Amino acid sequence: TLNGGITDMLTELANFEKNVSQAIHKYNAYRKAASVIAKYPHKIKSGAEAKKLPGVGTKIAEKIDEFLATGKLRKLEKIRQDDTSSSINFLTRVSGIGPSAARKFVDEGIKTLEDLRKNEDKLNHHQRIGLKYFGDFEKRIPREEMLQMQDIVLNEVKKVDSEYIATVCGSFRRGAESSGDMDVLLTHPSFTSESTKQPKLLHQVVEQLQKVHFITDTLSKGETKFMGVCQLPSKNDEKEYPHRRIDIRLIPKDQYYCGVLYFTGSDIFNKNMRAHALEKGFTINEYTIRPLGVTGVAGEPLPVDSEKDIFDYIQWKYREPKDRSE
DNA sequence: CCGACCGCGCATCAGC
DNA sequence: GCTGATGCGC
DNA sequence: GTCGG
Ligand SMILES: Nc1nc2c(ncn2[C@H]2C[C@H](O)[C@@H](COP(=O)(O)OP(=O)(O)CP(=O)(O)O)O2)c(=O)[nH]1
Ligand SMILES: [Cl-]
Ligand SMILES: [Cl-]
Ligand SMILES: [Cl-]
Ligand SMILES: [Cl-]
Ligand SMILES: [Cl-]
Ligand SMILES: [Mg+2]
Ligand code: NA
Ligand code: NA
Ligand code: NA
């Protein structure tokens, strides 16, 4: 919040480039700058001071001067007044509707929450659930509620097979007092990078969760990735809790650390760390860390027995989850 | 300059 | 049916 | 939009 004005501005510019301009790199450029400045322990007094941080170049430096001077940015004021941009931005807030779909809907006159509702026939399954819970997915989840959700999931998973290990990751694992959703890493001895000794490993869990009415909907589902909706049970006479987004990722047991590193994030932190890995000659995904051969082709998985082993490989001092919130 | 910008699962489409 | 490109998301 | 070679 120290530099909240500036970071909000950069985020708005990032989302604009992503949703309207469909310019992913400009999007990521603004995000990075926002991230670097959010972490900066001083109240920025000028663009120049900001340019000193990696990620802030000449352009963002100017915008920061304009912002610090007037408390606003013309580029944004104009964008806010543009109907197409505003429409596209709004629609992209529905889960399942990205930049393309949003622009197409607008081409059909479907630009508001009202238009989306009377045109359900024009939405795929995911987008349909996104609209249904449009308001709920906008609410944050207090950590207290994340703890109740954690307890349900672990206990339910345990009932299916005592050997399943479910680990809540994402911002929750990073210690956040509130999370946008719940992220669950799931492992089972029958599933290793070596073999899948038992089928329906993810299915059984999803099934058990739906049975106790925890999982309410399904956006998408595969052998290793589940993307849906869940809701805590409410007591007698009390207003029921909001529906929450939930992701469940089944990863080979023997590749847990690369998996938990990945799911703990943050997303930006992962991008920076993977980028750094490359510079050091490695490549990192959710399954392994491999060296980059002379020809650039990835080599064989390197042995890993902790998240720290991954950090060491790329010559980075270990960073506890709570400090990976970039 | 100017090329790189992390890496991957699922849903959906077009071409065969 | 399949493979691959594209959208969307984590 | 920013950066490093
Ligand atoms: N390499 C990558 N990894 C990624 C990426 N997007 C997401 N992720 C990883 C890291 C996230 O923590 C994790 C969960 O995804 P989530 O969106 O839930 O992020 P949280 O950190 O939990 C913030 P919250 O608002 O939900 O509290 O998935 C990506 O582009 N590239
Ligand atoms: Cl771009
Ligand atoms: Cl503004
Ligand atoms: Cl691992
Ligand atoms: Cl791999
Ligand atoms: Cl921590
Ligand atoms: Mg999350
Ligand atoms: Na800079
Ligand atoms: Na969306
Ligand atoms: Na998530």
Short mmCIF file of C-alpha atoms (C1' of nucleotides) and ligand atoms in Angstrom, two decimals:
data_model
loop_
_atom_site.label_atom_id
_atom_site.label_comp_id
_atom_site.label_asym_id
_atom_site.label_seq_id
_atom_site.Cartn_x
_atom_site.Cartn_y
_atom_site.Cartn_z
CA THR A 1 0.00 0.00 0.00
CA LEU A 2 3.05 2.24 0.54
CA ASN A 3 3.04 2.89 -3.23
CA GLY A 4 -0.54 1.72 -3.75
CA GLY A 5 -1.44 4.46 -6.19
CA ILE A 6 1.36 3.64 -8.60
CA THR A 7 0.93 -0.14 -8.40
CA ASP A 8 -2.82 0.01 -8.93
CA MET A 9 -2.14 2.15 -11.99
CA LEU A 10 0.38 -0.30 -13.37
CA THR A 11 -2.02 -3.20 -12.78
CA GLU A 12 -4.82 -1.39 -14.64
CA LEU A 13 -2.42 -0.87 -17.53
CA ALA A 14 -1.40 -4.52 -17.38
CA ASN A 15 -4.96 -5.81 -17.48
CA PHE A 16 -5.73 -3.40 -20.33
CA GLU A 17 -2.86 -4.69 -22.44
CA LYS A 18 -3.88 -8.29 -21.71
CA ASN A 19 -7.65 -8.08 -22.18
CA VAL A 20 -8.02 -5.31 -24.77
CA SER A 21 -4.65 -5.14 -26.56
CA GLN A 22 -4.09 -8.89 -26.27
CA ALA A 23 -0.41 -7.96 -25.83
CA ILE A 24 0.79 -10.49 -23.25
CA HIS A 25 4.34 -9.15 -22.99
CA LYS A 26 3.24 -5.57 -22.29
CA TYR A 27 0.93 -7.16 -19.73
CA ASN A 28 3.81 -8.98 -18.05
CA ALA A 29 6.04 -5.91 -18.28
CA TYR A 30 3.50 -3.87 -16.26
CA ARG A 31 2.97 -6.70 -13.76
CA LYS A 32 6.69 -7.04 -13.06
CA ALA A 33 7.07 -3.29 -12.52
CA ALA A 34 4.05 -3.34 -10.24
CA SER A 35 5.60 -6.25 -8.33
CA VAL A 36 9.04 -4.65 -7.98
CA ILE A 37 7.51 -1.39 -6.72
CA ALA A 38 5.10 -3.10 -4.31
CA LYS A 39 8.15 -4.63 -2.64
CA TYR A 40 10.17 -1.37 -2.62
CA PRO A 41 10.39 -0.23 1.06
CA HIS A 42 10.21 3.51 0.26
CA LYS A 43 7.41 5.85 -0.78
CA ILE A 44 8.50 6.65 -4.35
CA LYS A 45 9.01 10.37 -4.94
CA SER A 46 9.67 10.34 -8.70
CA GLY A 47 9.84 8.33 -11.89
CA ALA A 48 13.64 8.59 -11.77
CA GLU A 49 13.76 6.92 -8.35
CA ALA A 50 11.50 4.21 -9.79
CA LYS A 51 13.58 3.67 -12.91
CA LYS A 52 16.35 2.49 -10.58
CA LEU A 53 14.40 -0.70 -9.96
CA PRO A 54 14.72 -3.50 -12.56
CA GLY A 55 11.53 -3.66 -14.57
CA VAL A 56 10.85 0.05 -14.54
CA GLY A 57 11.98 1.68 -17.76
CA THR A 58 11.56 5.07 -19.40
CA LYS A 59 7.84 4.72 -20.17
CA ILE A 60 6.70 3.67 -16.71
CA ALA A 61 9.04 6.33 -15.33
CA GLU A 62 7.12 9.05 -17.18
CA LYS A 63 3.71 7.68 -16.18
CA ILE A 64 4.85 7.64 -12.56
CA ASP A 65 5.79 11.33 -12.80
CA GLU A 66 2.40 12.11 -14.31
CA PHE A 67 0.70 10.12 -11.56
CA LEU A 68 2.66 11.59 -8.65
CA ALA A 69 1.95 15.06 -10.07
CA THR A 70 -1.81 14.85 -10.77
CA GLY A 71 -2.90 11.68 -9.01
CA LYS A 72 -4.06 10.25 -12.31
CA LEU A 73 -3.04 9.06 -15.75
CA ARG A 74 -4.64 10.36 -18.95
CA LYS A 75 -3.99 7.15 -20.86
CA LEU A 76 -6.18 5.36 -18.29
CA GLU A 77 -8.86 8.08 -18.09
CA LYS A 78 -9.30 7.76 -21.84
CA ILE A 79 -9.37 3.96 -21.71
CA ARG A 80 -11.99 4.13 -18.97
CA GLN A 81 -14.17 6.29 -21.21
CA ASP A 82 -13.85 3.97 -24.21
CA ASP A 83 -16.92 1.73 -24.36
CA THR A 84 -15.37 -1.18 -26.22
CA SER A 85 -12.40 -1.33 -23.84
CA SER A 86 -14.67 -1.09 -20.80
CA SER A 87 -16.95 -3.82 -22.13
CA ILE A 88 -14.09 -6.15 -23.00
CA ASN A 89 -12.53 -5.57 -19.57
CA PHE A 90 -15.75 -6.37 -17.75
CA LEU A 91 -16.58 -9.54 -19.68
CA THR A 92 -13.03 -10.89 -19.17
CA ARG A 93 -13.87 -10.97 -15.45
CA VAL A 94 -16.18 -13.94 -15.96
CA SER A 95 -14.24 -17.17 -15.53
CA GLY A 96 -13.91 -18.85 -18.90
CA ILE A 97 -14.15 -15.65 -20.93
CA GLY A 98 -10.73 -14.52 -22.10
CA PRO A 99 -9.63 -11.62 -24.37
CA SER A 100 -10.84 -13.29 -27.57
CA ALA A 101 -14.26 -14.41 -26.37
CA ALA A 102 -14.82 -11.04 -24.72
CA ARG A 103 -14.09 -9.16 -27.94
CA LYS A 104 -16.33 -11.51 -29.92
CA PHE A 105 -19.25 -11.19 -27.53
CA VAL A 106 -18.95 -7.41 -27.77
CA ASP A 107 -19.13 -7.79 -31.55
CA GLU A 108 -22.50 -9.43 -31.00
CA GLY A 109 -23.85 -6.74 -28.73
CA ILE A 110 -23.41 -8.93 -25.64
CA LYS A 111 -21.63 -6.44 -23.34
CA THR A 112 -23.24 -6.58 -19.92
CA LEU A 113 -24.10 -8.94 -17.10
CA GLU A 114 -27.68 -8.69 -18.35
CA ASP A 115 -26.66 -9.65 -21.89
CA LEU A 116 -24.71 -12.65 -20.63
CA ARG A 117 -27.66 -13.97 -18.66
CA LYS A 118 -30.13 -13.81 -21.55
CA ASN A 119 -27.55 -15.44 -23.82
CA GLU A 120 -26.52 -18.46 -21.75
CA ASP A 121 -27.06 -20.54 -24.88
CA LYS A 122 -23.99 -18.75 -26.26
CA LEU A 123 -21.70 -19.76 -23.38
CA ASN A 124 -19.69 -22.98 -22.99
CA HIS A 125 -19.85 -24.94 -19.72
CA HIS A 126 -16.98 -23.16 -17.98
CA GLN A 127 -18.24 -19.68 -18.89
CA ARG A 128 -21.68 -20.78 -17.76
CA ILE A 129 -20.42 -21.60 -14.27
CA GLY A 130 -18.33 -18.43 -14.26
CA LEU A 131 -21.46 -16.31 -14.76
CA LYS A 132 -23.52 -18.29 -12.25
CA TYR A 133 -20.95 -17.48 -9.54
CA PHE A 134 -19.75 -14.19 -11.01
CA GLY A 135 -20.23 -12.37 -7.73
CA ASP A 136 -18.86 -15.04 -5.43
CA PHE A 137 -15.63 -15.52 -7.39
CA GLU A 138 -15.02 -11.80 -6.75
CA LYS A 139 -14.90 -12.30 -2.98
CA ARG A 140 -11.70 -13.12 -1.06
CA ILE A 141 -11.51 -16.14 1.26
CA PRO A 142 -10.54 -15.35 4.88
CA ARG A 143 -7.75 -17.63 6.12
CA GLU A 144 -10.10 -18.82 8.84
CA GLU A 145 -12.37 -20.21 6.13
CA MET A 146 -9.38 -21.65 4.24
CA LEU A 147 -8.54 -23.61 7.39
CA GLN A 148 -12.04 -25.11 7.57
CA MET A 149 -11.81 -25.97 3.86
CA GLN A 150 -8.37 -27.53 4.41
CA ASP A 151 -9.68 -29.71 7.21
CA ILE A 152 -12.58 -30.99 5.11
CA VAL A 153 -10.44 -31.81 2.08
CA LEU A 154 -7.67 -33.58 4.01
CA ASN A 155 -10.12 -35.59 6.09
CA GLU A 156 -12.22 -36.51 3.05
CA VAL A 157 -9.16 -37.51 1.04
CA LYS A 158 -7.92 -39.57 3.99
CA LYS A 159 -11.21 -41.47 4.00
CA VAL A 160 -10.76 -42.43 0.36
CA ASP A 161 -7.25 -43.80 0.86
CA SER A 162 -5.05 -43.23 3.89
CA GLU A 163 -2.07 -42.98 1.53
CA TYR A 164 -3.19 -39.80 -0.27
CA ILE A 165 -1.33 -36.66 0.80
CA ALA A 166 -3.17 -33.39 0.16
CA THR A 167 -1.25 -30.15 0.60
CA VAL A 168 -2.88 -26.69 0.43
CA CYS A 169 -0.62 -24.45 -1.63
CA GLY A 170 -1.01 -21.11 -3.36
CA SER A 171 -1.22 -17.93 -1.29
CA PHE A 172 -2.43 -20.01 1.65
CA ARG A 173 0.88 -21.89 1.86
CA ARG A 174 2.59 -18.51 1.55
CA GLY A 175 0.84 -17.44 4.78
CA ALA A 176 -1.71 -15.00 3.30
CA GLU A 177 -4.51 -13.82 5.60
CA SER A 178 -6.89 -14.15 2.64
CA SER A 179 -6.81 -16.13 -0.61
CA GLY A 180 -8.54 -15.75 -3.96
CA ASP A 181 -9.12 -19.52 -4.08
CA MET A 182 -7.96 -22.89 -2.77
CA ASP A 183 -5.12 -24.83 -4.37
CA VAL A 184 -4.58 -28.47 -3.49
CA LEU A 185 -1.54 -30.54 -4.39
CA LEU A 186 -2.35 -34.22 -4.32
CA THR A 187 0.00 -37.20 -4.22
CA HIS A 188 -0.44 -40.95 -4.05
CA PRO A 189 2.21 -43.72 -3.98
CA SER A 190 0.51 -45.48 -6.89
CA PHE A 191 1.34 -42.55 -9.16
CA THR A 192 5.00 -41.79 -9.84
CA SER A 193 7.01 -40.46 -12.77
CA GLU A 194 7.70 -44.18 -13.05
CA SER A 195 4.15 -45.44 -13.45
CA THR A 196 0.42 -45.10 -12.86
CA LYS A 197 -0.31 -48.27 -10.89
CA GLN A 198 -3.90 -47.22 -10.18
CA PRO A 199 -6.46 -45.41 -12.37
CA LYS A 200 -9.03 -42.78 -11.34
CA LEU A 201 -6.73 -41.45 -8.61
CA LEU A 202 -7.93 -37.86 -9.02
CA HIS A 203 -11.47 -38.97 -9.90
CA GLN A 204 -12.03 -40.83 -6.62
CA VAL A 205 -11.12 -37.76 -4.59
CA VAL A 206 -13.30 -35.43 -6.70
CA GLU A 207 -16.08 -38.01 -6.36
CA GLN A 208 -15.74 -38.17 -2.56
CA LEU A 209 -15.69 -34.36 -2.34
CA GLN A 210 -18.79 -34.03 -4.49
CA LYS A 211 -20.48 -36.70 -2.34
CA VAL A 212 -20.16 -34.61 0.82
CA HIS A 213 -21.37 -31.62 -1.17
CA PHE A 214 -18.05 -29.81 -0.89
CA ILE A 215 -17.36 -29.70 -4.64
CA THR A 216 -20.43 -28.10 -6.23
CA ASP A 217 -19.41 -27.68 -9.86
CA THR A 218 -16.75 -28.63 -12.38
CA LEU A 219 -15.15 -26.20 -14.80
CA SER A 220 -12.76 -28.80 -16.26
CA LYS A 221 -11.42 -32.20 -15.27
CA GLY A 222 -8.64 -34.54 -16.39
CA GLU A 223 -6.32 -37.27 -15.11
CA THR A 224 -4.16 -34.85 -13.12
CA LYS A 225 -5.88 -31.45 -13.06
CA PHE A 226 -9.25 -30.56 -11.59
CA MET A 227 -10.70 -27.07 -11.88
CA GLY A 228 -13.98 -26.40 -10.13
CA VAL A 229 -16.13 -24.98 -7.36
CA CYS A 230 -16.60 -25.78 -3.66
CA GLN A 231 -18.52 -24.41 -0.66
CA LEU A 232 -18.22 -24.78 3.09
CA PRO A 233 -21.33 -26.21 4.80
CA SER A 234 -23.33 -23.68 6.80
CA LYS A 235 -25.18 -24.36 10.06
CA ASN A 236 -28.91 -24.21 10.76
CA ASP A 237 -30.48 -20.84 9.91
CA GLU A 238 -27.17 -19.25 8.94
CA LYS A 239 -26.54 -17.63 5.55
CA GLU A 240 -24.56 -20.07 3.48
CA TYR A 241 -20.97 -19.32 2.52
CA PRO A 242 -20.05 -18.04 -0.97
CA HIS A 243 -19.06 -20.57 -3.60
CA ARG A 244 -15.27 -20.79 -4.02
CA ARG A 245 -12.96 -21.70 -6.88
CA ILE A 246 -10.90 -24.82 -6.28
CA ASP A 247 -7.95 -26.36 -8.12
CA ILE A 248 -6.66 -29.86 -7.46
CA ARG A 249 -3.44 -31.02 -9.08
CA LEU A 250 -2.25 -34.63 -8.93
CA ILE A 251 1.54 -34.84 -9.28
CA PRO A 252 3.87 -37.84 -9.33
CA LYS A 253 4.79 -38.62 -5.72
CA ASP A 254 8.51 -38.73 -6.48
CA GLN A 255 8.27 -35.23 -7.99
CA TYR A 256 6.64 -33.56 -4.97
CA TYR A 257 9.11 -30.71 -4.35
CA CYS A 258 9.08 -29.46 -7.91
CA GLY A 259 5.31 -29.78 -7.71
CA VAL A 260 4.82 -27.92 -4.41
CA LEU A 261 7.34 -25.26 -5.47
CA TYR A 262 5.23 -24.70 -8.57
CA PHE A 263 1.81 -24.66 -6.82
CA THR A 264 3.00 -22.47 -3.95
CA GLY A 265 3.85 -19.72 -6.43
CA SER A 266 3.32 -16.92 -6.73
CA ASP A 267 2.83 -16.87 -10.50
CA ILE A 268 5.18 -13.95 -10.95
CA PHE A 269 7.69 -15.56 -8.56
CA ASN A 270 7.57 -18.71 -10.64
CA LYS A 271 8.18 -16.71 -13.83
CA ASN A 272 11.15 -14.87 -12.35
CA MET A 273 12.63 -18.04 -10.87
CA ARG A 274 12.22 -20.02 -14.11
CA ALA A 275 13.69 -17.13 -16.08
CA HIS A 276 16.63 -17.06 -13.69
CA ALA A 277 17.00 -20.82 -14.01
CA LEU A 278 17.43 -20.42 -17.76
CA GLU A 279 20.15 -17.79 -17.30
CA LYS A 280 21.95 -20.26 -15.05
CA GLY A 281 21.49 -23.01 -17.62
CA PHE A 282 18.52 -24.92 -16.22
CA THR A 283 14.85 -25.31 -17.02
CA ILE A 284 12.18 -25.78 -14.37
CA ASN A 285 8.65 -27.13 -14.62
CA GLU A 286 6.27 -28.62 -12.03
CA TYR A 287 7.85 -32.06 -12.41
CA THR A 288 11.60 -31.50 -12.58
CA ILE A 289 14.61 -29.26 -12.95
CA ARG A 290 16.86 -30.17 -15.86
CA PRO A 291 20.05 -28.61 -17.27
CA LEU A 292 20.10 -26.97 -20.70
CA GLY A 293 22.50 -28.77 -23.02
CA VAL A 294 24.81 -27.01 -25.46
CA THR A 295 22.17 -27.39 -28.17
CA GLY A 296 19.70 -25.86 -25.73
CA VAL A 297 17.76 -29.12 -25.46
CA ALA A 298 16.77 -30.04 -21.91
CA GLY A 299 18.77 -32.81 -20.30
CA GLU A 300 17.76 -35.43 -17.75
CA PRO A 301 15.98 -34.64 -14.47
CA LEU A 302 18.37 -33.62 -11.69
CA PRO A 303 18.00 -35.34 -8.30
CA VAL A 304 15.84 -33.34 -5.86
CA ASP A 305 14.99 -34.00 -2.20
CA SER A 306 13.74 -30.61 -1.09
CA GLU A 307 12.58 -27.27 -2.43
CA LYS A 308 15.95 -25.94 -1.33
CA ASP A 309 17.80 -28.27 -3.68
CA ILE A 310 16.06 -26.49 -6.53
CA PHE A 311 17.12 -23.06 -5.27
CA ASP A 312 20.74 -24.23 -4.84
CA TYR A 313 20.92 -25.55 -8.40
CA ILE A 314 20.26 -22.04 -9.69
CA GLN A 315 22.46 -20.40 -7.04
CA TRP A 316 19.60 -18.71 -5.18
CA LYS A 317 19.45 -18.54 -1.40
CA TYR A 318 16.38 -20.35 -0.11
CA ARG A 319 13.26 -18.25 0.19
CA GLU A 320 10.52 -19.40 2.53
CA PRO A 321 7.03 -19.53 0.96
CA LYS A 322 5.97 -16.34 2.77
CA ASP A 323 8.69 -14.46 0.89
CA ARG A 324 7.71 -15.75 -2.58
CA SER A 325 4.73 -13.43 -2.85
CA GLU A 326 5.77 -11.41 -5.89
"C1'" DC B 1 19.53 -2.24 -32.23
"C1'" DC B 2 16.62 -6.41 -31.37
"C1'" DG B 3 15.33 -10.64 -29.70
"C1'" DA B 4 13.69 -12.75 -25.59
"C1'" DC B 5 9.97 -12.62 -22.51
"C1'" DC B 6 8.10 -19.86 -17.83
"C1'" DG B 7 6.01 -23.94 -18.63
"C1'" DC B 8 2.05 -26.85 -18.94
"C1'" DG B 9 -3.29 -29.26 -18.34
"C1'" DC B 10 -7.79 -29.17 -20.34
"C1'" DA B 11 -11.43 -27.79 -23.73
"C1'" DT B 12 -12.34 -26.86 -28.25
"C1'" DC B 13 -11.78 -26.31 -32.95
"C1'" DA B 14 -10.23 -27.33 -38.00
"C1'" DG B 15 -8.21 -30.51 -41.09
"C1'" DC B 16 -7.63 -35.14 -42.25
"C1'" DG C 1 -11.48 -41.17 -34.78
"C1'" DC C 2 -6.19 -38.69 -34.66
"C1'" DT C 3 -3.09 -34.66 -34.29
"C1'" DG C 4 -2.05 -29.96 -33.78
"C1'" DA C 5 -3.13 -25.11 -33.14
"C1'" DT C 6 -5.53 -21.86 -30.10
"C1'" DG C 7 -8.00 -20.26 -26.01
"C1'" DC C 8 -8.05 -20.07 -21.22
"C1'" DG C 9 -6.39 -21.02 -17.02
"C1'" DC C 10 -3.14 -22.48 -12.99
"C1'" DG D 1 7.40 -2.31 -22.11
"C1'" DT D 2 11.99 -3.63 -20.50
"C1'" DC D 3 16.19 -5.69 -20.80
"C1'" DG D 4 20.95 -7.69 -21.97
"C1'" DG D 5 24.13 -9.05 -25.29
N1 LIG E 1 4.73 -21.29 -13.65
C1 LIG E 1 3.53 -20.73 -13.38
N2 LIG E 1 2.89 -21.04 -12.26
C2 LIG E 1 1.69 -20.44 -12.18
C3 LIG E 1 1.10 -19.57 -13.07
N3 LIG E 1 -0.15 -19.18 -12.63
C4 LIG E 1 -0.29 -19.79 -11.48
N4 LIG E 1 0.80 -20.55 -11.14
C5 LIG E 1 1.01 -21.30 -9.90
C6 LIG E 1 1.56 -20.42 -8.77
C7 LIG E 1 0.31 -20.07 -7.98
O1 LIG E 1 0.61 -19.79 -6.61
C8 LIG E 1 -0.48 -21.36 -8.09
C9 LIG E 1 -1.96 -21.23 -7.78
O2 LIG E 1 -2.60 -20.36 -8.71
P1 LIG E 1 -3.46 -19.11 -8.20
O3 LIG E 1 -3.92 -18.37 -9.40
O4 LIG E 1 -4.47 -19.66 -7.25
O5 LIG E 1 -2.49 -18.22 -7.46
P2 LIG E 1 -2.35 -17.96 -5.99
O6 LIG E 1 -0.91 -17.68 -5.74
O7 LIG E 1 -3.04 -18.99 -5.16
C10 LIG E 1 -3.07 -16.26 -5.66
P3 LIG E 1 -4.83 -16.35 -5.02
O8 LIG E 1 -5.49 -15.08 -5.41
O9 LIG E 1 -5.40 -17.65 -5.49
O10 LIG E 1 -4.71 -16.39 -3.54
O11 LIG E 1 -0.26 -21.79 -9.45
C11 LIG E 1 1.81 -19.20 -14.24
O12 LIG E 1 1.47 -18.41 -15.13
N5 LIG E 1 3.04 -19.84 -14.32
CL CL E 2 3.04 -7.64 -26.16
CL CL E 3 -5.65 6.96 -13.14
CL CL E 4 10.92 -33.06 -7.21
CL CL E 5 9.76 -33.02 -17.09
CL CL E 6 6.79 -19.51 4.98
MG MG E 7 -4.97 -19.73 -5.41
NA NA E 8 14.83 0.43 -14.40
NA NA E 9 -11.95 -14.52 -17.60
NA NA E 10 -5.99 -21.55 -8.17
#
